[PDB]
Structure 1
């Protein structure tokens, strides 16, 4: 699809068998989701943005369906104020900016 930017570019995702809403975020190198459990092992990590940093848990090889495009990648989980789909996954669904 073509997503305009007059509203937040939110999409529905399915991950770990749950339905969630997430922001398509070209400004995020990574994909960061609020608290949730996920199949498998993880390594701790920190990430930053505008106001500082947070600790997240990093899970590799997670399956996620973003608008029905399945992708497998690293998903980070922790106290982010909002679910964000970052460039690690945006590249995998072929997402581009266009103007």
Structure 2
């Protein structure tokens, strides 16, 4: 579909058998999601943006479905105020910016 940007580009995603709401975020290199106790191994990471850094858990090869488009890649889990789908997964669902 086509998503205008008058409001935040929020979509439903399916991850870890749970449905959540996330932003389609061209400004995020990678995907960052709210605290969720996913199974499997992970490695610690620090990610920075406006206001500073947060500590997150990096999970690899995670399956996510975004508006019915399946993707698989890195998901960073931590105390983020918003869930963002970043370019690592947006490329996989074929998402472009257009103007």
TM-score, normalized by the shorter chain, greater than 0.5:
yes
Q: Report SS of the residue matched to 2:75.
A: strand
- Gaps of at least 5 residues in structure 2 are none
List per-residue Cα deviations over 1:30-63 (Å, max 9, x = no partner). 1000100112100000001111001100000000
In the alignment, the residues of structure 2 paired with residue 75 and residue 90 of structure 1 have an alpha-carbon distance, to the nearest angstrom, of 12
How much is the aligned-residue C-alpha RMSD, in angstroms?
A: 0.5
- Gaps of at least 5 residues in structure 1 are none
Moved over 4 A (4+): none
Q: Report SS of the residue matched to 1:19.
A: strand
Q: How many residues align?
A: 99
Calculate the TM-score normalised by the size of structure 1.
0.98
